[PDB]
Design a protein around this ligand. Sequence first.
Ligand SMILES: [Cl-]
Length: 372
Amino acid sequence: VLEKAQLALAIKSETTPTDADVNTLTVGVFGVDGWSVIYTKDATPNSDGTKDVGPQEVYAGEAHVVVVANAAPVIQTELAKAKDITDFIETTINLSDETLTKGLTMSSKVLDVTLVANTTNYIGYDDEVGDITVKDISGKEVYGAGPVPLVRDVASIALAGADIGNPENANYESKSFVLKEVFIASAKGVSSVASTEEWGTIEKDFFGDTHFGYLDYKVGLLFLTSPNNIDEGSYKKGLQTKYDALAKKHVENDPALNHEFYVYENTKGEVKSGESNVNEAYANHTLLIVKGDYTYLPQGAKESITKENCYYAIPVGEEVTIDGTEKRSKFYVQRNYKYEISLTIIGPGSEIPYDPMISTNVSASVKVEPWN
Ligand SMILES: [Cl-]
């Protein structure tokens, strides 16, 4: 026999939809002895900038609790079928669901609490454990560290700027670069919903014994595969799935500059075993690729030349500036950070997206900022 209790839970929160919206909360409560209660409710707004999930019946005892914001409808059901905390947090979410209209998927860490029988248990309603009263319903705060923080399950990638410079080599002067398009390649399109620790890794491994492969990478544009297969190259392997949200045309009125792209974690950039001609710095790490028209003046020429529709590809987070003036190598793409990429174009790009021609002719500076 198991005793009954009630649970109400408050989360910390930061009308056009925004990347901080919390529309729904899915709560998984897993007793240490094997019982589980999982439910989804609309998040109720609160005057203090927190949001609540109203009392729900659960069982008494020690339990592990995790909160997911903005789970897609089908994910809500998958989560409700979890039998244990590991299957819950390992639930696979899909990138194509991550819109400001849904709200971005976010999760808490796994909480450990003791639920008291025959009473209202609160999580997140006070900064200390103990008996409290909320709207005349007395009960007990069982977590005691303020409202439960949520961490986004996506990262934000944007091109902050793209201008010209000259190479030391100096066969020529750069004259201009006009941006036409920005897109993302090798975006992991799947992720775990939550991590055990706060802001922990939720990245899905690809290939090996997993069932994720090339179609689970997402890409903003597709290219011709015949006669010259240009949809693949040293920079990008596999037939990846097109997702229109991962490309943006640059037009004066609706710019590609500062447009944010949302992606899941990718630090491993796995390719299939046995692939040829793999540049491991690019394939299949998430890339930001720009296309535009580059104009230069050759040494001693009367006039300049414009190469139209040149590409420049960047592996996102190979080297980052973080905490203002610190540096990290191999940071790649991690959850709940904003990546601001500034490009210095120093020569003509490639006519094709996934291989260079002679030299990359681009230098990139990537700032990473925690998100909001
Ligand atoms: Cl567009």
